[PDB]
């Protein structure tokens, strides 16, 4: 009867086209502002002093870029970790010079993605679902907050944060290799196993369902039209695909349970990306990966090279060349 | 300096295959409106 109850009834209605919910009250204003500023800053945005040395790096399309090289540049080294909104900038020209829109996009992104995650919970509550799709979405939220939030914190500047682009991503990955040795770190190892394993069990499960489909169509029409939507009959012989994989490797390595099978597809990647995103986090605070340089010696004591020493000389090439003007002192403490 | 044959590569790489996929949808809906026998078959 009241105005608030007629507003709570609408905002929590599943009869809307898109469910809004109470998290959409701060998902939609956040992500539309992260979007509408990203499209403008990617297309039309002046160059940005990223190294704090007043050498402005172009990153937008109107200043001679493309899809690959164009990128929303991170904020300045001069700012660093300080909060830099528009009203604390004394003009928009001073805001866009010093890496303004990187903080406006990222902070409205991480609020909107952490609200998109809670929104996946909310609709599962109002639909009668068991709730935990949003726990599986915690794994890219862990990884998005690792390269945009946690790594600028432990390194003390948003300038070490990830550039919102495509070539800026590979500037981020290579400089992160030289300074932290991520490939030898066992948490990037535990998530390469998460996505190689994840793409394995995806294409391994998706093939054994498509292999054992039941005849419901003719050879002229499509294979997919043998599934009517909302039917109650099972659309594939699960005993058939169990007997196949029960002979392809051996018998006891096969899940006859389809529920425990469809749980292992959700376990393996998500655990692999939780562990990986806490690799960037523990390497944000300079707890680097393994270092086996000069580890094998002869009885005389001369250093015998290994593959890690060849990997070290690739890291030394990126270390002596990243931010080639920003350094003045012999050790990259930042 | 960009290659001036790339405009012909991209804008025909967009339009020619994308206008192809539109045609397979329009004749799909015409066959469905063709069999249905009401007001649109002719």
């Amino acid at each position: 009867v009241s105005l608030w109850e007629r507003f709570c009834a609408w905002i929590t209605s599943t009869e809307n086209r898109l469910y809004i919910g109470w998290f959409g009250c701060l998902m939609f204003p956040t992500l539309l502002t992260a979007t509408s500023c990203f499209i403008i800053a990617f297309i039309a945005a002046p160059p940005v002093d990223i190294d704090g040395i007043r050498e402005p790096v172009a990153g937008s399309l109107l200043y001679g870029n493309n899809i690959i090289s164009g990128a929303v540049v991170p904020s300045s080294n001069a700012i660093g970790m300080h909060f830099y909104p528009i009203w604390e900038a004394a003009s928009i020209d001073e805001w866009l010079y010093n890496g303004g829109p990187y903080q406006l996009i990222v902070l409205h992104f991480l609020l909107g993605v952490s609200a998109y995650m809670g929104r996946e919970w909310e609709l599962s509550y109002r639909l009668g679902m068991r709730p935990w799709i949003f726990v599986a979405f915690s794994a890219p939220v862990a990884a998005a907050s690792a390269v945009f939030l946690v790594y600028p914190i432990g390194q003390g500047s948003f300038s070490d944060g990830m550039p919102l682009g495509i070539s800026g991503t590979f500037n981020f990955m290579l400089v992160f290799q030289a300074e932290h040795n991520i490939l030898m770190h066992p948490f990037h190892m535990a998530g390469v196993a998460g996505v190689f394993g994840g793409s394995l069990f995806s294409a391994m499960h998706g093939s054994l369902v498509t292999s054992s489909l039941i005849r419901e169509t003719t050879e002229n029409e499509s294979t997919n039209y043998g599934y009517k939507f909302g039917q109650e009959e099972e659309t594939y012989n699960i005993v058939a695909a169990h007997g196949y994989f029960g002979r392809l490797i051996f018998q006891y390595a096969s899940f006859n349970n389809s529920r425990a099978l469809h749980f292992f597809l959700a376990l393996w990647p998500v655990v692999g990306i939780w562990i990986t995103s806490m690799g960037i986090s523990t390497m944000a605070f300079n707890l680097n990966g393994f270092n086996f340089n000069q580890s094998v010696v002869d009885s005389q004591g001369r250093v015998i090279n290994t593959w890690a020493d060849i990997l070290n000389r690739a890291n030394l090439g990126i270390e002596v060349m990243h931010e080639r003007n920003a350094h003045n002192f012999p050790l990259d403490l930042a | 300096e960009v290659q001036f044959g790339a405009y012909l590569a991209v804008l025909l790489g967009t339009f020619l295959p994308a206008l192809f996929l539109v045609n397979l949808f329009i004749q799909t809906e015409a066959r469905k409106a063709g069999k249905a026998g009401g007001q649109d078959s002719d």
Binding site: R17, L61, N66, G230 | -
Partner: peptide
């Protein structure tokens, strides 16, 4: 002149995302 093509590809991609969400073929039981 060159960046005009890149912008048209980007907003043209966001058009077909708009039509796929709102003008989707709504699936129906029976």
């Amino acid at each position: 002149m060159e960046a005009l093509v890149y912008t048209f590809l980007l907003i043209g991609t966001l058009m077909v995302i708009f039509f796929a969400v709102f003008f989707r073929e709504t699936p129906r039981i029976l």
